[PDB]
């Protein structure tokens, strides 16, 4: 049930857009430079330049979800943690949506924002409309269009440098990765514990005790090892409910911050909200 | 010797309990579904009656007319040197006899020639005085009992075993107590008529049985037939919905045996220890080391017998399969009443001041009466024990002082008040009671499966098999896994290696001293994709950890290709995208279009928005839309009576719950 | 789950009590008590987590009743896809339909 | 587990039906209510069990009649109080009684 | 029977409750208190001896 | 909950150690360790919820 | 090992009593035998004559 919920969480956040939009080929709308938040045709990478930095900041336990039998046998010298989990029956399943597919959804969302049912409108007349929702008069933007665009381009740059250096902003995404790894490695370490039996090694017990005596000790080990699995499952259920609440709130901001102008105080930023852009991150999203 | 198939034959009632409208799962000796069965045909042209092995029980069926097949003979050597049991229907009644029979090479009835003579008899039973018949039987031999099951079905098949399902019922439980490894059929001759019979073998398996509303077994599922069958046994249902399911990891069974013991050639010195001319006194007990030898101790069966024998950290039936390290023997003499004190946790003069065992003792204790050698009619007084001391002894310590004793220190000279000698003599006599007769005691101690060993039981070694799943036995440690050479370096006093899980992942070969690594045989995740049993029975299987361009797959029917999720077998690959009926993973999905098809998932409808710095679009029309949204609000409210769920209506069980604490108050507060 | 042995000789309390005396029976009965108490505790823990999920859904249903049914909402996609006009609630088993 | 012909010395009694009693059928003891049953036991069968492994059927040794066994305790109960300080009286609600 | 005894500050038993007397007494023993608050409580299922 | 027996003869550690030797006490103390660990785990799980 | 073996999960009882008065004689009784040489061990409740 938990595994199925994880796919549902991602779908409700990124799959709001029904119709996919092709990436504009100009990336410069009315003095605003939208290059660095859209895919670069020259660069092979499908994700954007800002999305490149985020993926590098988060260390991931496993790249590919395939671990062949030969590889674990050929590298017995290294005490690989993943081979250890696999040999005790613990598995990790791949997500339904690939990292490229999520990047496609975010590319279309930015394209639709920057070009718009579609109802296309220039990026200038649109920002003038936003100023009306704030409370300012439209003539303010037209008279001061040039400096507003310059401030917008410098602000995009100030964000670029912060991600280039080491930032604590992605700490929450890092935390989720570490919690999952620790729980799996705790189960492997709990196989060494005696649960009132003479020994924790099943091969030792069966070698020196007969059937009737062996059952007494084996029963103790079974009782203790079942409790370890039950505790792990209960912890996972509580963690999942927390992730689900975070996923629900993220989908709300996508509808209200990215697909419209929000008049709620501090919901889509500290100041007076104009608009928002989403960007994909490992096991998360950045606004 | 034609080969046939047993589709679903060979199900029988497991026990004597009555069940109805239920599903029951059990592990027992069953004939697996669709297993090979040999055919034996008896006609005027050919008369088949060879000796077939038993092999942990058989399934026997006969398609014939005119009553050709009559019975069976079960035995080991099938001659007059061993017991055999005969079950025959001689046209008048059923006769069962188990005797030393002089078996005939050609046993048959005439339209009788079974045996010549019979002596050393044990059991006897007599009963009251286009094929069209199928008769089915099951035989098994457990704990000296030969079980017999029986069933009947009318048929019309010409010359082959009909397919179908039929449940057998018990008819006999024979207390024969004979060793059975072979059997033969008894067929009558007329030439011969048209008849045939078939034989199958039983293996341990887990079956799921379906009881109808009258208590009849109408269907069964073999959990080991295929991945779909295993899914049903785990879910405990005969129907499965559409979707993808996670089954057990990929399993492998061993195909070999490896035994590795060190080179020893000398028998252990049983005679010099048990049969030595002289043993010491209990207070001055002696200890001896046991050098590399073979511990058979079956040679003792001829000469030496023990009145006491008790092992503590090991079972008595495992001594012949182990290797022992740091073996020592202790010898001394006590009187009969004192033998009970040679055990951990005892008190008394012997345990307090003479000889004490540790609480966590590992070894065996032996003793035997020796009144004929250690006792004289005049009286023997060479054996002594200590009865005065300041404090108690520590385990495996001795005191051989002879300093005079005075209570509360204050040394003394022997001829003085409150001055005593601390030792006493036993004084064994020929005519005294057994409680005062002498006994010789030997105590053996050792460790197991932790360090190099030089003493081992009688067993035969084998060659090493590497890069293959096998059963292994290294100096008494057994298991299943794969052996490969290792780069680890062991110090001379190290014999085994262990990991953080405490699994034994390394061992030094005793004969060649080569370090080896040990790894499990089962590895890799599996999952089953089905469109629903009601729709079809075919399924596709996804292997997450296989690269199919030595494949670790159960079977390759067809449609094998590599996806981003793994190696998929049993689905057609199409190039068009669809709405992801069933999510496989990594952007792959499956559907039932009639075969299972796998395709890449589509993200949505595609379009392009033209951008213009001078244009704008404004709607001129509108429509009214109504949509529905559904939300849960509340769930069911429940309560629990813990004294009824636990202990039912039992009173004494309820009393035990009260003494157990019974934290039921907090359970109900949470639910309330 | 009442049919499972928890290391004892049998899962039937009437079978143990019939052929084992008080001392021998007490050994087996304690094993069954421990396992059956553990079964109850697992059921209660799952119910608490399930109730937490329902409570969150109930709170959101109360928010939409106030904002979508008793007034006009400007939040995008909160009270339907298009531009919201009004809403009507209808009762359902263990839920509500808007 | 099955039919038995060797028994200890004990005096039998008459069957009592539709009433909670202490029973002992061929050495198996317990408490419950005995009523006639329609289940059809095969000759080699003596006892019957349900999914919970509770013993719920038995063939009478003397008359070979099939009898159903059910517990004696059943039904929900709750207590209403106004507070012991205010009053010592209470009311009782029986959920499963008409 | 099962009884709930009350020990005072000097070690003297001054009161008691018999859990088998009536439904209210059984409620007291389960919660282990001589005082009960207003409300409705769930008790053991109807018993027949 | 520290006063509850968990299948052991006594719930008081000092009582068991006073009259039983090392091996026979190791059986009873294990029963108390498992039970008291279960109490702690239940408390932690409730705190998380 | 060679004459009479009980199964691991044995249900029953074992009885023995001394019969030296009837089974023993001054000269010596040699009518009772037992096997001490065999290839392998016996299975439960199986005999070899
Ligand atoms: C080892 O020898 C010492 C030397 O005598 C023992 O110590 C004495 O123990 C007795 C008995 O408790 C006391 O009454 C003496 O006062 C001790 N003497 C000294 C000098 O300490 C010691 O008990 C012996 N160890 C054992 C296990 O018996
Ligand atoms: C049942 O009888 C068979 C045949 O007499 C026994 O098989 C023999 O076992 C010995 C000891 O291992 C071998 O040396 C022989 O070669 C075996 N005979 C054959 C024909 O293979 C079998 O051991 C007996 N079973 C029991 C439990 O005693
Ligand atoms: C000097 C040889 C001492 C024996 C070697 C030491 C350990 C051998 C391994 C296990 C103990 C074997 C018990 C031998 C007595 C058999 C008793 C019997 O006949 O039933
Ligand atoms: C937009 O930004 C990119 C990256 O900083 C820069 O290379 C490009 O020149 C900018 N646009 C224009 C029109 O200069
Ligand atoms: C078995 O038969 C042969 C052949 O007559 C005979 O020599 C032998 O003594 C018989 N064995 C026994 C045990 O009677
Ligand atoms: C069958 O065997 C029984 C018992 O040995 C015997 O009495 C009877 O005469 C036999 N019948 C035939 C036809 O051989
Ligand atoms: C077996 O038969 C022989 C004679 O052939 C006899 O001497 C011996 O006592 C018999 N043994 C048994 C156990 O009946
Ligand atoms: C059970 O038995 C009754 C009575 O003979 C019969 O009518 C019914 O068909 C049987 N049930 C099944 C499933 O055969
Ligand atoms: C058994 O002991 C007897 C008597 O000493 C002897 O004759 C016989 O040869 C021994 N057997 C073996 C196998 O050693
Ligand atoms: C045991 O024998 C093998 C071959 O017979 C030999 O290679 C090995 O060295 C021997 N063991 C020792 C310790 O010498
Ligand atoms: C599988 O093997 C092929 C050919 O060797 C290789 O191209 C491919 O990358 C492999 N896949 C994985 C997941 O290792
Ligand atoms: C919208 O289009 C429909 C289609 O015929 C038309 O009947 C209706 O009058 C239009 N609405 C307006 C406001 O023109
Ligand atoms: C036992 O005795 C009663 C009355 O004496 C009789 O009715 C019953 O049939 C007998 N049992 C059997 C199995 O016949
Ligand atoms: C306890 O004993 C003291 C000593 O006389 C007394 O004063 C007090 O009243 C006693 N407590 C009660 C509750 O009576």
Contacts of B120 (CB under 8 A, 6+ apart): B83, B99, B100, G49
Question: Which residues are registered as beta bridge partners of B30?
Answer: B203
With CA atoms as reference, report the closest residue to B199 among B219, B183, B187. Answer: B183
Q: Which residue in chain F has the smallest CA separation from C34?
A: F6
Q: Hunting for tokens 């799962």 — which residue is that?
A: B25
**Cβ neighbour number for residue A152 with a 10 Å cutoff:** 16
For residue G2, what are its two tokens? 């060679």
For residue B292, what are its two tokens? 């590399």
SS3 category, B136:
strand
Measured CA distances, B576 to B587, B592, D18 (Å): 13, 14, 70
8 Å CB contact between A134 and A272: yes
CA B7, distance to chain mean position in Å, is 28
With CA atoms as reference, report the closest residue to B332 among B342, B345, B343. Answer: B342
Ligand nearest to the CA of B298: 3
8 Å CB contact between A83 and A94: no
Cβ neighbours of F35 in B, within 8 Å = 661
> Phi-psi category of E34—alpha, beta or left, where left has phi over 0 and alpha has psi -120 to 50?
alpha
The secondary structure of residue A254, as a DSSP letter, is I
**Cβ neighbour number for residue B25 with a 10 Å cutoff:** 12
Sign of the torsion formed by the C-alpha atoms of B239, B243, B249 and B253: positive
With CA atoms as reference, report the closest residue to B185 among B150, B151, B137. Answer: B137
Q: Which of A186, A190, A193, A196 should one mutate to test binding to chain F, selecting the residue with the greatest count of F CBs within 10 A?
A: A196
Q: Hunting for tokens 């996609």 — which residue is that?
A: C77
What technique solved it? cryo-EM
Q: Which atom of ligand 14 is nearest to the CA of E8?
A: 13
SS3 category, B413:
coil
Cβ neighbours of C40 in F, within 8 Å = none
Mutate to test the pocket of ligand 7, among B100, B101, B120, B123 (most ligand atoms within 8 A of CB): B120
Q: Alpha-carbon distance C86 to C73, whole Å?
A: 9
Q: How far is the CA of B621 from the centre of ligand 12 (A)?
A: 6
* Side-chain-facing half-sphere of A76: CA atoms under 13 Å: 19
End-to-end CA distance of chain B: 71
CATH assignment, B3-247: 2.60.120.960
Query: 3-state SS of chain F?
Result: CCCCCCCCCCCCHHHHHHHCCHHHHHHHHHHHHHHHHHHHHHHHHHHHC
Question: Which residues are registered as beta bridge partners of D34?
Answer: D69
For residue C66, what are its two tokens? 């106030």
The secondary structure of residue B301, as a DSSP letter, is H
Q: Alpha-carbon distance B446 to B115, whole Å?
A: 56
CB of B20 less than 8 A from some CB of D: yes
Minimal Cβ distance to G45: which of B83, B120, B144: B144
CB of G36 less than 8 A from some CB of B: yes
For residue A46, what are its two tokens? 């499908």
For residue A52, what are its two tokens? 């490149």
SS3 category, B336:
helix
8 Å CB contact between D44 and B18: no
SS3 category, B391:
coil
Measured CA distances, A46 to A16, B586, F12 (Å): 20, 17, 68
Assess whether the C-beta atom of B21 lies below 6 angstroms from ligand 8: no
Q: Alpha-carbon distance B240 to B586, whole Å?
A: 25
The secondary structure of residue A22, as a DSSP letter, is P
Q: Which of D33, D73, D93 should one mutate to test binding to chain B, selecting the residue with the greatest count of B CBs within 10 A?
A: D73
* Side-chain-facing half-sphere of F25: CA atoms under 13 Å: 13
Q: How far is the CA of B268 from the centre of ligand 10 (A)?
A: 20
Sign of the torsion formed by the C-alpha atoms of B146, B152, B157 and B158: positive
Q: Hunting for tokens 């020639």 — which residue is that?
A: B113
Q: How far is the CA of E47 from the centre of ligand 1 (A)?
A: 67
For residue B595, what are its two tokens? 């075969």
Q: Which of residues 9-38 of D touch C (CB under 8 A)?
A: 27-30
Cβ neighbours of B16 in D, within 8 Å = 1-2, 44-47
Q: Alpha-carbon distance B205 to B220, whole Å?
A: 12
CA A278, distance to chain mean position in Å, is 12
SS3 category, D21:
strand
Measured CA distances, A77 to A72, A73, A74 (Å): 9, 9, 8
DSSP B161-189: PPPS--EEEEEEEEE------EEEEEE-B
Radius of gyration, alpha carbons of chain B: 38
- For chains B and G, CB pairs below 8 A equal 21
Q: Alpha-carbon distance B440 to B307, whole Å?
A: 11
8 Å CB contact between B101 and B80: yes
Contacts of C40 (CB under 8 A, 6+ apart): B640, B642, B645, B646, B667
With CA atoms as reference, report the closest residue to A196 among C27, F30, B312. Answer: F30
Q: How far is the CA of B145 from the centre of ligand 6 (A)?
A: 26
- Residue closest via CA to ligand 8's atom 5 equals B214
A231 and F41: CB-CB below 8 Å?
Answer: yes
Q: How far is the CA of B252 from the centre of ligand 11 (A)?
A: 24
Contacts of B111 (CB under 8 A, 6+ apart): B188, B189, B190
With CA atoms as reference, report the closest residue to B161 among B11, B34, B299, B259. Answer: B34
For residue B621, what are its two tokens? 């029309």
Radius of gyration, alpha carbons of chain E: 13
């Amino acid at each position: 049930g938990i595994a199925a919920e994880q796919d549902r969480n991602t779908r409700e956040v990124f799959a709001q857009v029904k119709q996919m939009y092709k990436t504009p080929t100009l990336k410069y709308f009315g003095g605003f430079n939208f290059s660095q938040i859209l895919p670069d045709p020259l660069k092979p990478t499908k994700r954007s330049f800002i999305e490149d930095l985020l993926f590098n900041k988060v260390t991931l336990a496993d790249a590919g979800f395939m671990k062949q039998y030969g590889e674990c046998l050929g590298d017995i010298n290294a005490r690989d943690l993943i081979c250890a989990q696999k040999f005790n029956g613990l598995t990790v399943l791949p997500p339904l949506l690939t990292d490229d597919m999520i990047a496609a959804y975010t590319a279309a969302l930015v394209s639709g924002t920057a070009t718009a049912a579609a109802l296309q409108i220039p990026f200038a007349m649109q920002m003038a409309y936003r100023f009306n929702g704030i409370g300012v008069t439209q003539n303010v933007l037209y008279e001061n269009q040039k400096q507003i665009a310059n401030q917008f381009n410098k602000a995009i740059s100030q964000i670029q440098e912060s991600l280039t250096t080491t930032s604590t902003a992605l700490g929450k995404l890092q935390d989720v990765v570490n919690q999952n790894a620790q729980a799996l490695n705790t189960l492997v370490k709990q196989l060494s514990s005696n649960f009132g039996a003479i020994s924790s090694v099943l091969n030792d017990i069966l070698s020196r005790l007969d059937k009737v005596e062996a059952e007494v000790q084996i029963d103790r080990l079974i009782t203790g090892r079942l409790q370890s699995l039950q505790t792990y499952v209960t912890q996972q259920l509580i963690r999942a409910a927390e992730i689900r609440a975070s996923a629900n709130l993220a989908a709300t901001k996508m509808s209200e911050c990215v697909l419209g102008q929000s008049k709620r105080v501090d919901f889509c930023g500290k100041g007076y909200h104009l608009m928002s852009f989403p960007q994909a991150a490992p096991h998360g999203v950045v606004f | 010797y034609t080969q046939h198939t047993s589709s679903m034959r060979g199900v029988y009632y497991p026990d004597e309990i009555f069940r109805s409208d239920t599903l029951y799962l059990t592990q027992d000796l069953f004939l697996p579904f669709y297993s090979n069965v040999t055919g034996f045909h008896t006609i005027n042209h050919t008369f088949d009656n060879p000796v077939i092995p038993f092999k942990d029980g058989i399934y026997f069926a006969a398609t014939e007319k005119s009553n050709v097949v009559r019975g069976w003979v079960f035995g080991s050597t099938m001659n007059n040197k061993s017991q055999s049991v005969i079950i025959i229907n001689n046209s008048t009644n059923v006769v069962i006899r188990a005797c030393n029979f002089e078996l005939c090479d050609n046993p048959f009835f005439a339209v009788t020639m079974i045996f010549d003579n019979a002596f050393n008899c044990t059991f006897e039973y007599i009963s009251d005085a286009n094929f069209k018949h199928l008769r089915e039987f099951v035989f098994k031999n457990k704990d000296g009992f030969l079980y017999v099951y029986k069933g009947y079905q009318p048929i019309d098949v010409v010359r082959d075993l009909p397919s179908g399902f039929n449940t057998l019922k018990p008819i006999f439980k024979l207390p024969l107590g004979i060793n059975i490894t072979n059997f033969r059929a008894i067929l009558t001759a007329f030439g011969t008529s048209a008849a045939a019979y078939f034989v199958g073998y039983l293996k341990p398996t887990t079956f799921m049985l379906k009881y109808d509303e009258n208590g009849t077994i109408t269907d069964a599922v073999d959990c080991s037939q295929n991945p779909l069958a295993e899914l049903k046994c785990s879910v405990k249902s005969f129907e499965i919905d559409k979707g993808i399911y996670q089954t057990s990891n990929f399993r492998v069974v061993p195909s070999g045996d490896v035994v590795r013991f060190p080179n020893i050639t000398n028998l252990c010195p049983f005679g010099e220890v048990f049969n030595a001319t002289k043993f010491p006194s209990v207070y001055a007990w002696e200890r001896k080391k046991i050098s590399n030898c073979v511990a058979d101790y079956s040679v003792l069966y001829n000469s030496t017998f023990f009145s006491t024998f008790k092992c503590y950290g090991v079972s008595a039936t495992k001594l012949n399969d182990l290797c022992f390290s740091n073996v020592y023997a202790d010898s001394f003499v006590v009187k009969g009443d004192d033998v009970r004190q040679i055990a951990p946790g005892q008190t008394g003069v012997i345990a307090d001041y003479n000889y004490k065992l540790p609480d966590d003792f590992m070894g065996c204790v032996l003793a035997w009466n020796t009144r004929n050698i250690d006792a004289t009619s005049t009286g023997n007084y060479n054996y002594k024990y200590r009865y005065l001391r300041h404090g108690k002894l520590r385990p495996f310590e001795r005191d051989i002082s002879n300093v005079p004793f005075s209570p509360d220190g204050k040394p003394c000279t022997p001829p003085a008040l409150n001055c005593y000698w601390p030792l006493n003599d036993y004084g064994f006599y020929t005519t005294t009671g057994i409680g005062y007769q002498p006994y010789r005691v030997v105590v053996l101690s050792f460790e197991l499966l932790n360090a190099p060993a030089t003493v081992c039981g009688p067993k035969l070694s084998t060659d090493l098999i590497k890069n293959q799943c096998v059963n292994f036995n290294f100096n008494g440690l057994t298991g299943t896994g794969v052996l490969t050479p290792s780069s680890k370096r062991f110090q001379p006093f190290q014999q085994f290696g262990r990991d953080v899980s405490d699994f034994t992942d390394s061992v030094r070969d005793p004969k060649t001293s080569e370090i080896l690594d040990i790894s499990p045989c089962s590895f890799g995740g599996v999952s089953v994709i089905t469109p629903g049993t009601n729709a079809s029975s075919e399924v596709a299987v996804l292997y997450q950890d296989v690269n199919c361009t030595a494949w670790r797959i159960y079977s390759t029917g067809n449609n094998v290709f590599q996806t981003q999720a793994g190696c998929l077998i049993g689905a057609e690959h199409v190039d068009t995208s669809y709405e992801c009926d069933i999510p496989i993973g990594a952007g792959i999905c499956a559907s039932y279009h009639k075969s299972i098809v796998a395709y890449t998932m589509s993200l949505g409808a595609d379009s392009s928005i033209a951008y213009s710095n001078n244009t704008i679009a404004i709607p001129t029309n509108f429509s009214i839309s109504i949509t529905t949204e559904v939300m849960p609000v509340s769930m069911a409210k429940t309560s629990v009576d813990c004294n009824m769920y636990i202990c039912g209506d039992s009173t004494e069980c309820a009393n035990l719950l009260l003494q157990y604490g019974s934290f039921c108050t907090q359970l109900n507060r949470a639910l309330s």
